[PDB]
């Protein structure tokens, strides 16, 4: 928000005490997110001495009873306590000591107040020949880390001489055999093979803030799933908390599972399926959008990536989510569904846009079955559905339900319609009653419009009964119907039909003998819109 006239003249100095180091199960000293600081807003030009006075007074210590160890970042990405000389550097501005860094974190080393009331004070530290080591103890049985404080020790000291300290600081019986590692960085824990060598030799690039992890040398450790601190830090390095969410469920808070970076699709699916009490194959997964919070690309069953690949574009700050949905069919069958866009015609003779997903290898029957599963039918009608093919607002065909879906191309002008068969068309008299294709058109017959339909035809019909049937279907205006011009269309020619003469019989609707292949005669209506 709003800055201030001289907000730029200040800097955050974050003091951390050793009590924050206890309980930390991860790498380095503490978790940046979980650590509690004592924060100081300090003038950049303030001297170190002024800040030491201020700190000592504020937190309740004598100035000669505290030592400052600035938390300093290393190339590997770690952050460890570094050396600061209270005397020598005391006159330097805080901003130059921090090296323009801000906020600037500092470790505060004090004497234990319960060991100081007994009279003890702050030990001396030789910058050139001493070093401050931090000690952790790994327990394989509980698979956990126990902070064992720090020590001042000469560089030339032998590893073997640090063992008694490690033992009695962890509550170990003395002369207990110990396995020693250096926690160099996340995913790098290096065992110390020779205890008879000095610290300098044993540890490459030996610095203040270095960490030695140690554990019992005990066969029982092989019963633990993480027998050594090495494997512990490894498993920890690849450990990740994933939030699984159902994309169907609105605002699903989802559930959190702790998993490994290395896991493949099979393992993840198995896990989620377990916590959901279902078959893994009945699960489809979605990678996150990841800038937005929401489901992204779906995963194929054969997806060859790992969990890390799926979560890699989340920030380390961000909650790592993974989407999914439960399926009614095994995911392979679900992947073999064909997106089929078509039109559903209802009881009200009104068009709706629908998209169905029959099996890609299925027949027309399966499509119609999907559409039947999707809709409601008339109060009473056939209960049987059919598939029409319409081009230029004209029905160019009916597809038999055994026909293959792969032979259909729902193109631009090509519209596939699904409709419930009317009762008087289900079973008709085949050599008597005939189903005719009907369409609208304004002026000439090329220009066409409206919803085309199939109409039943009797014998010597008395044509205005058939037209009151048509009218019974349409129902727009009440004898604006009157302006309807009725025509018979064949190969582009059209003959208008006299309404009161009643000329009807099938013979005027079939093509030449043995003819299917080229377009059949159809009924035409004129009235525009």
């Amino acid at each position: 928000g709003p800055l201030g006239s001289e907000a730029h003249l200040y800097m955050q100095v974050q003091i951390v005490a050793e009590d924050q180091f206890c309980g930390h199960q991860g790498n380095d000293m503490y978790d940046e997110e979980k650590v509690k600081y004592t924060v100081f807003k300090v003038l950049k030009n303030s001297s170190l001495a002024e800040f030491v006075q201020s700190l000592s007074q504020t937190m309740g210590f004598p100035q000669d009873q505290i030592r400052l160890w600035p938390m300093q970042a290393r190339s590997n990405g770690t952050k460890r306590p570094a050396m600061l000389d209270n005397e020598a550097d005391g006159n330097k501005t805080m901003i130059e000591l921090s090296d323009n860094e801000n906020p600037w974190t500092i470790f505060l080393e004090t004497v234990d107040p319960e060991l100081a009331a007994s009279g003890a004070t702050l030990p001396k530290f030789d910058k050139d020949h001493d070093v401050m080591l931090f000690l952790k103890m790994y327990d394989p049985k509980t698979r956990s880390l126990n902070y064992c404080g720090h020590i001042y020790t000469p560089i030339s000291c032998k590893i073997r001489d640090l063992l008694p300290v490690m033992c009695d600081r962890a509550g170990f019986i003395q002369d207990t055999s110990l396995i020693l590692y250096e926690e160099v960085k996340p995913n790098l824990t290096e065992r110390i093979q020779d205890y008879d060598v000095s610290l300098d030799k044993a540890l490459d690039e030996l610095m203040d803030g270095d960490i030695i992890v140690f554990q019992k040398d005990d066969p029982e450790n092989d019963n633990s799933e993480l027998p050594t601190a090495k494997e512990y830090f490894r498993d920890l390095y690849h450990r990740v908390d994933v939030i699984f969410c159902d994309k169907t469920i609105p605002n699903d808070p989802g559930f959190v599972v702790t998993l490994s970076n290395r896991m493949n699709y099979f393992q993840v699916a198995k896990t989620v399926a377990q916590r959901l009490n279902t078959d893994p194959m009945l699960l489809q997964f979605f990678k996150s959008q990841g800038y937005r919070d929401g489901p992204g690309n779906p995963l194929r069953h054969n997806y060859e990536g790992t969990l890390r690949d799926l979560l890699q574009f989340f920030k380390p700050r961000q909650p790592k989510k993974l989407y999914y949905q439960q399926l009614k069919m095994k995911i392979t069958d679900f992947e073999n569904r064909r997106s089929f866009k078509c039109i559903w015609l209802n009881s009200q003779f009104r068009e709706e846009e629908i998209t169905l997903y029959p099996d890609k290898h299925g027949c027309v029957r399966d499509l119609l079955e999907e559409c039947k599963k999707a809709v409601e039918l008339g109060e009473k009608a056939s209960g049987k559905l059919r598939l029409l093919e319409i081009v230029s607002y004209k029905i160019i065909g009916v597809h038999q339900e055994d026909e293959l879906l792969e032979c259909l191309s729902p193109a631009t002008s090509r519209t596939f319609r699904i409709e419930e068969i009317p009762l008087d068309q289900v079973d008709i008299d085949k050599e008597n009653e005939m189903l005719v294709t009907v369409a609208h058109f304004h002026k000439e017959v090329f220009g066409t419009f409206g919803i085309p339909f199939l109409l039943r035809i009797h014998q010597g019909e008395h044509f205005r009964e058939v037209m009151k049937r048509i009218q019974s279907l349409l129902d727009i205006q009440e004898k604006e119907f009157e302006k309807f011009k009725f025509a018979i269309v064949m190969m582009g020619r059209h003959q208008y039909i006299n309404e009161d003469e009643y000329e009807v019989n099938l013979k005027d609707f079939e093509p030449q003998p043995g003819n299917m292949s080229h377009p059949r005669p159809w009924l035409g209506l004129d009235h525009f819109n």
């Binding site: 290393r74 160099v184 990841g290 800038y291 779906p298 995963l299 574009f313 193109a411």
Partner: protein, 882 residues
Amino acid sequence: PTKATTTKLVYQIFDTFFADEEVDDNIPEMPSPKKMHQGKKKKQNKNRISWVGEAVKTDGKKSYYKKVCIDAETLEVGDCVSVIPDDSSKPLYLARVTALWEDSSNGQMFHAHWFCAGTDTVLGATSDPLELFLVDECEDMQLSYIHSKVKVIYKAPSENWAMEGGMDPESGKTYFYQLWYDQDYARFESPPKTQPTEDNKFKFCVSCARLAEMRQKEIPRVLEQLEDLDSRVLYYSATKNGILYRVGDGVYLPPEAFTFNIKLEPVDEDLYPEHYRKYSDYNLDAPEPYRIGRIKEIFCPKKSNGRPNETDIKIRVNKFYRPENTHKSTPASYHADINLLYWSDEEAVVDFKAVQGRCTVEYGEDLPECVQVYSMGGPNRFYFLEAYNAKSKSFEDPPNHARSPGNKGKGKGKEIKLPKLRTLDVFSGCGGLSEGFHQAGISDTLWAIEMWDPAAQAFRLNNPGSTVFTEDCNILLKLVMAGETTNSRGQRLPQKGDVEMLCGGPPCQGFSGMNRFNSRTYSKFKNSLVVSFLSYCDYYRPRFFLLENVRNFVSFKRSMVLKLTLRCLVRMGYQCTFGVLQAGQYGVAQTRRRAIILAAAPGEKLPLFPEPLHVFAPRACQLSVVVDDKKFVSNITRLSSGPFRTITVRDTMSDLPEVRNGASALEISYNGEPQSWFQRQLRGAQYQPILRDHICKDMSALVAARMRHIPLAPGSDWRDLPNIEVRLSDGTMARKLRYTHHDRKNGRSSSGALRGVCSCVEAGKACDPAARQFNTLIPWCLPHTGNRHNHWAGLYGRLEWDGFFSTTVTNPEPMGKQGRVLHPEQHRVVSVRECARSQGFPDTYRLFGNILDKHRQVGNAVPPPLAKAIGLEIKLCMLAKA
């Protein structure tokens, strides 16, 4: 519009000269050119030869002088002389006198640094008869051979060379030179700068110095030793070909270097009447990519007198596994990154001679960068996350001695960003070239010229900060030369100093035949867009210049287009070269050879050609050019191998949703994750709700039926078509193809059926017009003209998932010349998106117009990966100029 806008220079070049892949190479190969001055020569009879002054320096057997006198004519060091060929042949040997000395052992001697006749370069008859070119070619010679003292001047570029474009040649006739000439690579470059010390000042020869540098650079030598044993001697670093190899560095090896411990029906001729035309089709595959090893030991064996043999430098290495090298084999490559490897404890010893280059192979976790940032930050970078055990056929975490000893990352204890070149892209198209160049990070294309409107629109869409001209390039250049600031619509014209880089692909149409120029075709080429483009080059004088075209550009009119282009560039004072590149070697699956012409300004460094990144089918990788019986290659040192595996059709379009014949949908869902490295590159890391231009042409019912009757098996085309009656989608009936004639050459079916469709099989040259057949599943026209066109192999053919695209065309037609367009599985021609994918276009790259427009835009484009490679090769030169 006919006459091309031109500069007086270029116009004079093309006036003073006065008087569709035909696959010009399947080659009766040539060793080629054969340093030219070898052999004997005619000595001259000279009456008096005497040393002027006294010896400036005396050496072991020679005594050097500053100046000599032959028959009353003086002759100093630095002068030039003419010597006569022993053969009656015309060429008159010319040289520069680099040193004069008396050798009592041998006689009166001088060192001749030869010139090259301009007509003995690639230029040939096009060259200025007075022009010479520096070469590395020098020899000691007895003074008696000198026929005459000839004058040769150095045509140095003016301090105002960049503005001399458009100025008339008025600005006597003697021998002159301006450029050094590499004969193998056909490289015209600025004269070498190498200076003498003052001790050799009198005898100094540039050719000798460069020969020294070269031959000293290419002898492998060990550097600093660190351990001596009973049988051998160990070193920390060896060096070869200028590159330095320390212990722990990555090493390229041939597939021959080491091996991995891993254990490695008759046809119905009634139903299939044309299948027999495949039996003449029953090609070496792509090579294995480089073996990759890590240097563990560098050692030389002792000669067993107890001293190391340093001619026999040897390397002990750790083997790396490519995912495809494991037991999971080739399918492990599908999802994996191309630079991904696995560590192994397997080792092998190889000669240092076998090393083909140094690479960087890191452990992915110790990288400060994310893996992909690392992968896209430098030329030769590989990484591993795991280690492979061939014995257990398993994967585990790498050993600790494998995480490079160099970065611990603790402490002591106890990125040059160039300004982008303002680029002018002539005949830009939708801008694939400019795209690749933008990816190289060397260019900002601010001006483009494209007459075809949809392509111009596309370029605008992909480059909103640029100015696209749709007017003829000639009238624009004419506008600029007339001192006009803008064109008619107010668009600002580029001016001298604005254009820093000039790139383009001029159409060759009408001169594109192979055979010699006549006055007609030369009249057409005289005003071609090539001459216009070269005129743009001469006028604007950019730092760099690229002319890309079809390969046969180097062979057009018996290489005269090429020779004249090069000649013109040389006349401008440019350093220049040419070469052929296969796009497939640079990260796409396509076969697409391109002729590349490069040019750099005098103050610049001439770019090399990109070293091939990907292995590719050898048949598609013939890069050499024959000009006037000389074979010219490029600087490319990679012939048989490459760092990365070949890109395939599977890599290219396996992630795309299944669509159908005549798919019209412009915006659809990807409906999945990227399945490959390639797809990952072209789609990006960010989520993409919309996939654009996955669309197919709408083929007639007949063609659709044919397509759906083509088998899915690799190698399938029209010759696998069954002859059958088919019911077409429109209701039409497709009749069986009838065979009405006996075919002489092809004989008779096992059944005894006739194989001819027409009378013309009898050579009678009739073509019974009544015998033509229509609406057949098996197209009549293909067996009709089959025998003459290699049985029309590939037509109505399907792409192979493991294969690659034939050159991506502008309008894919199943019966076209390029005509294997079909999808490997689905029945349809490949989509626009798929062609763009085959061209290396990012999926976010925008096209314009109807489907044929987009197809064409994609087809005429330079693959952005190729242009990126070239662009990086230019970036090196940008960096080198300091």
